[PDB]
Paper text:
In our study, M176–190 had the highest affinity for HLA-DR1 assayed (IC50 = 8 nM). This register placed the archetypal aromatic P1-Tyr into the P1 pocket as well as the favored P6-Ser and P9-Val. P4-Gly represented the only mismatch from mooted motif ideals. Outward TCR-facing residues were most varied at the N terminus (P−1-Try and P2-Lys) and the C terminus (P8-Arg). Despite being the highest-affinity binder, M176–190 did not distinguish itself by best satisfying EL/BA motifs compared with other epitopes with lower affinity (particularly S511–530). The strongest binding peptide, M176–190, also satisfied 3/4 binding pocket preferences: incorporating its mismatch at position P4 (Gly).
CD4+ T cells recognize a broad range of peptide epitopes of severe acute respiratory syndrome coronavirus 2 (SARS-CoV-2), which contribute to immune memory and limit COVID-19 disease.
Numbering used by the authors:
A (entry chain A): 1 to 182
B (entry chain C): 1 to 15
C (entry chain B): 0 to 190
C-alpha cells in the first residue's frame, strides 16, 4: 500500500428518492463531485480546480443512465429492497482546543447504507446552521458509505454540542456529544 | 487546464 | 426519517489501481445493487464477469459488444493513466506539515499517574512516525495511540498518549517524522 494509489470514480442513483451522485476519490479522499441541482463541478479544495477541470455534463448523462439501470435492476431482482445498515457516529475537533480561539467540530458518519442521512448540529440543545459545511457520501470497499459534517466554533467552558444523526436503520435519532474538559 | 476523463456509464440488459 | 418506503440503490465504481507510479495499472469496474456486487470488469481478466445471478444478463450482454470491450481493455491507458497524470500534482505530490502539541490530559498532581497527549494534526499524507522519550530514553511501553484519523478535508490527525508517573525534573519529548519535513519535529513537556 506504500507504492499503491487508488483512484475511484463512484456514482449512484437511489429510488424512490431520485437521488444521484458522481464523485472522484483518491486514496479515500474526495477530489470532486458534481452538484446535480447546480450542474457543476465542486472541487473538494479550491486549489484542485486550479490544476484540473471536468466537463460536468458527462456526469449528468452518466446519472441518467444510472437511473434507467436502477429501474431495470429493481425489476429484475423482483423488487428486492436494500436492508438498512445504521451508521457509526463520532465527534472530534480538528485541532487541540484552546479557549476562545477558533476551531472546528467534525461529525464523522461511517459504515451505513442507503446514502440518506439527516444531520443537525446542536449547541446547548439548539440547532446551529452558521458556517457549517459537509461532504457528499463517500464510497467504502464494503459498498457502504461515509460522510463528514463540519461546524466552526469558538470553544468555551459554557457551551455543549451534539451531532444529531437520523437514519432509517436507527430506532431513534442518535446524539454524539462534545464538551470542553477543564 | 487538463481535464479528468469520464468513465462512461453503460446501459444494462433488458427492459 | 419518517419515510418507511422501500429503497433501491445502484452503484457504479471505476477503480484505478496504480503500482510503482504508473508502471502497473489495474482497472476494476464494479456494479453494486443494494449492497451486493453483481458484475465486474477486471482488466487482468479482460471481460465482464458476473458476481451474482442478478448480474449474469449484463455480463453476457456487455461481452457481445466488441467496441465496449476494446474501449475497456484500453481504459488502463485512456482512463486510468490519464487521470493519474491530471491529478498527480495535488494528490500523489501533496505534502502538508503536521502541527505537534504536547499537553497533560488532566491537571493531576505530580507523583501520580497522568496521560501525556502528543497531538499531531493537519498533516498529509498518512504515513507518520510518533515516538515518546523520557529524559532522552525512548518509551515504548505505555504508548496508547488513537491511530490514523481521516478528517475528510485531505488532512489527518493522530493522538499518541504516554502513560507516565511524572517526577520533578523529568523532561518528556514527542518526536514526529513525516515526509513533509526532512528533520523530525520535537516538542517537550517539563514535569
Amino acid at each position: 500500500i506504500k507504492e499503491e494509489h487508488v483512484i475511484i470514480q463512484a456514482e449512484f442513483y437511489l429510488n424512490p428518492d431520485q437521488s444521484g451522485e458522481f464523485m472522484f476519490d483518491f486514496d479515500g479522499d474526495e477530489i470532486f463531485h458534481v452538484d446535480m441541482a447546480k450542474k457543476e463541478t465542486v472541487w473538494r479544495l479550491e486549489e484542485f480546480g486550479r490544476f484540473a477541470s471536468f466537463e460536468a455534463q458527462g456526469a449528468l448523462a452518466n446519472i441518467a443512465v444510472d437511473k434507467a439501470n436502477l429501474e431495470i435492476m429493481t425489476k429484475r431482482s423482483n423488487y428486492t429492497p436494500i436492508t438498512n445498515v445504521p451508521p457509526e457516529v463520532t465527534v472530534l475537533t480538528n485541532s487541540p482546543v484552546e479557549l476562545r480561539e477558533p476551531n472546528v467540530l467534525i461529525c464523522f458518519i461511517d459504515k451505513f447504507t442507503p446514502p440518506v442521512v439527516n444531520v443537525t448540529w446542536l449547541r446547548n440543545g439548539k440547532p446551529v446552521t452558521t458556517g457549517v459545511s459537509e461532504t457528499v457520501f463517500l464510497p467504502r470497499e464494503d459498498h457502504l458509505f461515509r460522510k463528514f459534517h463540519y461546524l466552526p466554533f469558538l470553544p468555551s467552558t459554557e457551551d455543549v454540542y451534539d451531532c444529531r444523526v437520523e437514519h432509517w436503520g436507527l430506532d431513534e435519532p442518535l446524539l454524539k456529544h462534545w464538551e470542553f474538559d477543564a | 487546464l487538463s481535464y479528468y476523463k469520464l468513465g462512461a456509464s453503460q446501459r444494462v440488459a433488458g427492459d | 426519517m419518517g419515510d418507511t418506503r422501500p429503497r433501491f440503490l445502484w452503484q457504479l465504481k471505476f477503480e484505478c489501481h496504480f503500482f510503482n507510479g504508473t508502471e502497473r495499472v489495474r482497472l476494476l469496474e464494479r456494479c453494486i445493487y443494494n449492497q451486493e456486487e453483481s458484475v465486474r470488469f477486471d482488466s487482468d481478466v479482460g471481460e465482464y464477469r458476473a458476481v451474482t445471478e442478478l448480474g449474469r444478463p449484463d455480463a453476457e450482454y456487455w461481452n457481445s459488444q466488441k467496441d465496449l470491450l476494446e474501449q475497456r481493455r484500453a481504459a488502463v491507458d485512456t482512463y486510468c493513466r490519464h487521470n493519474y497524470g491530471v491529478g498527480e500534482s495535488f494528490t500523489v505530490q501533496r505534502r502538508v506539515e503536521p502541527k505537534v502539541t504536547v499537553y497533560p490530559s488532566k491537571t493531576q498532581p505530580l507523583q501520580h499517574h497522568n496521560l501525556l497527549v502528543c497531538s499531531v494534526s493537519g498533516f498529509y499524507p498518512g504515513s507518520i512516525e510518533v515516538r515518546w522519550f523520557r529524559n532522552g530514553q525512548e518509551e515504548k511501553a505505555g504508548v496508547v495511540s488513537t491511530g490514523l484519523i481521516q478528517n475528510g478535508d485531505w488532512t489527518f490527525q493522530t493522538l499518541v498518549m504516554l502513560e507516565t508517573v511524572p517526577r520533578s525534573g523529568e523532561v518528556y519529548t514527542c518526536q514526529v517524522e513525516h515526509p513533509s519535513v526532512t528533520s523530525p519535529l520535537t516538542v517537550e513537556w517539563r514535569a
